[PDB]
Amino acid sequence: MQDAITAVINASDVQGKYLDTAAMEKLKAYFATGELRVRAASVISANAANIVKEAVAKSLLYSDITRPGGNMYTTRRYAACIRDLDYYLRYATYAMLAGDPSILDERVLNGLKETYNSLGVPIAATVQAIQAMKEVTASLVGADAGKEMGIYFDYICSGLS
Amino acid sequence: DAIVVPSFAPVKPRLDNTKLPLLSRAIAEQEAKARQADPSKPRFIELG
Numbered sequence: 144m145q146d147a148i149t150a151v152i153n154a155s156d157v158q159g160k161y162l163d164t165a166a167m168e169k170l171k172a173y174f175a176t177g178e179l180r181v182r183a184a185s186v187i188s189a190n191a192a193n194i195v196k197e198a199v200a201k202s203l204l205y206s207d208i209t210r211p212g213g214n215m216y217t218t219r220r221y222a223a224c225i226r227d228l229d230y231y232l233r234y235a236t237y238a239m240l241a242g243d244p245s246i247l248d249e250r251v252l253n254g255l256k257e258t259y260n261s262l263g264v265p266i267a268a269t270v271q272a273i274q275a276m277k278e279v280t281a282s283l284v285g286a287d288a289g290k291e292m293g294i295y296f297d298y299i300c301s302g303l304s
Numbered sequence: 305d306a307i308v309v310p311s312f313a314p315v316k317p318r319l320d321n322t323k324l325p326l327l328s329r330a331i332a333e334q335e336a337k338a339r340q341a342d343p344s345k346p347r348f349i350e351l352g
């Protein structure tokens with residue numbers, strides 16, 4: 144398992160060395176910014192439904208995707224699409240709290256591109272929907288917290304593409 | 305003994321039309337306007 148503090152600990156364990164000053168400083172930075180990250184994460188969870196609604200409205204709705212034959216034409220596909228965005232956001236916020244991009248790669252980005260390719264989901268459309276979520280999440284979270292959230296959101300998009 | 309005018313040979317034109325400027329504009333317009341929204345119709349969001 145990987146977290147920001149845990150990854151510093153894991154690197155130190157591989158060395159076998161006692162805690163270095165550089166390791167202490169990096170861990171201190173994680174301790175320092177945890178407050179802003181925590182408050183924003185709570186806000187994200189509270190307004191999670193509104194965020195995915197805003198994202199599909201801004202990117203994935205009123206287009207050919209939701210018009211016939213667009214991989215969202217049916218209610219089953221639409222429900223799976225909003226569910227997929229919801230999972231993307233949930234594991235992304237998990238990782239944003241953790242501070243480490245490794246967690247999302249472990250769960251969200253493990254075979255995700257292959258699965259989407261097999262099912263015929265548009266990779267680009269998913270990426271643009273993720274970016275639209277990034278804008279909405281930045282608006283709700285605020286600039287300081289949203290910038291941190293944006294980095295891990297963008298890591299998810301990079302894994303997809 | 306040769307025939308100066310043996311027969312008049314048909315020629316295949318080199319320049320293919322529907323690439324010519326006027327038809328090309330019109331072909332673009334008909335295609336693009338068809339893909340766009342249609343005036344005077346009740347249902348337009350249903351169409352793919």
Ligand SMILES: CCC1=C(C)/C(=C/C2=NC(=C\c3[nH]c(/C=C4\NC(=O)[C@H](C)[C@H]4CC)c(C)c3CCC(=O)O)/C(CCC(=O)O)=C2C)NC1=O
Pocket residue numbers: 203204205206209215216217218221
């Ligand atoms: C094949 C199954 C299927 C259906 C049916 C379907 C419909 C559908 N209805 C939509 C919107 C909508 N649907 C309604 C529905 C209603 N508002 C009302 O007052 C009524 C009570 C009610 C209908 C009689 C509204 C208001 C919107 C627009 C939402 C908005 O933009 O504010 C949207 C999102 C906007 C878009 O088209 O991109 C879809 C996809 N999609 C599907 O995949």
